[PDB]
């Protein structure tokens, strides 16, 4: 019950799943560096003591959380496609969602 089969087995399924499809490589490494930007901003708020604008922090933070959200919501539609939604309609909706999130996060940075 040491769960040694879990991380190795899911490591084989996921790590085999990456290089079989070249676009999921783009999606999950871009998700990973979005997590690095969230960690860099969060340790900027920890390293100093104040969050002085506090709309700049939630601007630069909710653009990374929201963009990670939209990337997972596209990866789930490319790995196993939804019934009424094509793979090309899986991507234009991501574009429109990402442009709306970029507008609201450039309005919220002031």
């Amino acid at each position: 019950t040491d769960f040694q089969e879990t991380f190795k087995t899911s490591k084989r399924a996921y790590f085999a799943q990456i290089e079989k499809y070249p676009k999921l490589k783009l999606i999950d490494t871009f998700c990973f560096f979005l997590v690095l930007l969230g960690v860099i901003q969060c340790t900027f708020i920890i390293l100093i003591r104040d969050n002085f604008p506090f709309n700049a922090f939630l601007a630069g933070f909710i653009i990374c959380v929201g963009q990670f959200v939209l990337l997972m919501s596209l990866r789930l539609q490319l790995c196993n496609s939804f019934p009424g939604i094509s793979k090309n309609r899986a991507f234009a909706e991501f574009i429109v969602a990402s442009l709306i999130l970029h507008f609201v996060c450039l309005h919220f940075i002031n």
């Binding site: 094509s86 090309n88 309609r89 991507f91 234009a92």
Partner: protein, 236 residues
């Protein structure tokens, strides 16, 4: 503001009065008890304040209204040839009251087709209608000809201070709009200045039918706009 209309064959008067009572002001303020007892004692002889106004209108007037700034007033009585008015508060000495009246006459007795050309009209407008005992410190008479009218000649019996020709867009004025011919008279008396303003203009049938054809142009370009937005392929 008057509004000539060839499609409805009607002329539509609307007047905005800003009247003061320049009589003597009343000491000890105003008390409704002394006013109401003064009504209940006898007969309402001749006194200072304003309770009713008698508006002398043209002969056949149809749709009477009397509004303030804040809403309409229901205390008005439009009998034949005479439009009686009760304001909300009685206008004592020095008090202000700004109101608006309006009515609707047919156009067949204010407008006359000329003889040389069929599409040339001559209008004679009553310069002043109001209560019988009023003095007018400023009058601006705006007559509004329809959208394709072109004014040739202008005559007034009373010497005005100013005159100008502009345009103003009313309902369904898709093009430039109504022709606002506005006079500015300074000092007038209700009883004395008996006059009519004479406008000679033209209004050809080329511009008479451009109103339903202009609204037809907007409906047509809206529906061809619907056609472009339904023959267009957007399917990713």
């Amino acid at each position: 503001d008057i509004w000539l209309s060839h499609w409805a064959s009607t002329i539509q008067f609307e007047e905005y009065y800003e009247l003061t009572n320049k009589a003597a002001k009343l000491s000890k303020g105003f008390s409704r008890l002394e006013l109401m007892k003064q009504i209940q004692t006898q007969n309402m002889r001749q006194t200072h304040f304003v309770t009713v106004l008698d508006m002398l209108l043209p002969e056949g007037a149809t749709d009477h209204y009397f509004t303030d700034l804040v809403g309409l007033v229901s205390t008005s009585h439009a009998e034949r040839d005479h439009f009686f008015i009760r304001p909300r508060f009685p206008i004592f000495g020095g008090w202000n009251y700004n109101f608006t009246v309006g009515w609707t006459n047919k156009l067949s007795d204010f407008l006359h087709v000329s003889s040389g050309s069929d599409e040339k009209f001559v209008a004679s407008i009553p310069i002043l209608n109001g209560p019988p005992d009023t003095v007018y410190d400023n009058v601006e008479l705006s007559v509004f000809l329809p959208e394709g009218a072109e004014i040739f000649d202008i005559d007034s019996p009373v010497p005005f201070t100013n005159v100008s020709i502009e345009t103003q867009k009313s309902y369904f004025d898709l093009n430039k709009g109504h022709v606002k011919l506005t006079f500015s008279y300074r000092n007038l008396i209700s009883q004395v200045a008996n006059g009519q303003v004479l406008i000679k203009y033209d209004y050809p049938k080329s511009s008479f039918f451009k109103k339903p054809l202009s609204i037809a142009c907007y409906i047509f370009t809206a529906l061809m706009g619907v056609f472009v937005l339904k023959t267009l392929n957007m399917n990713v």
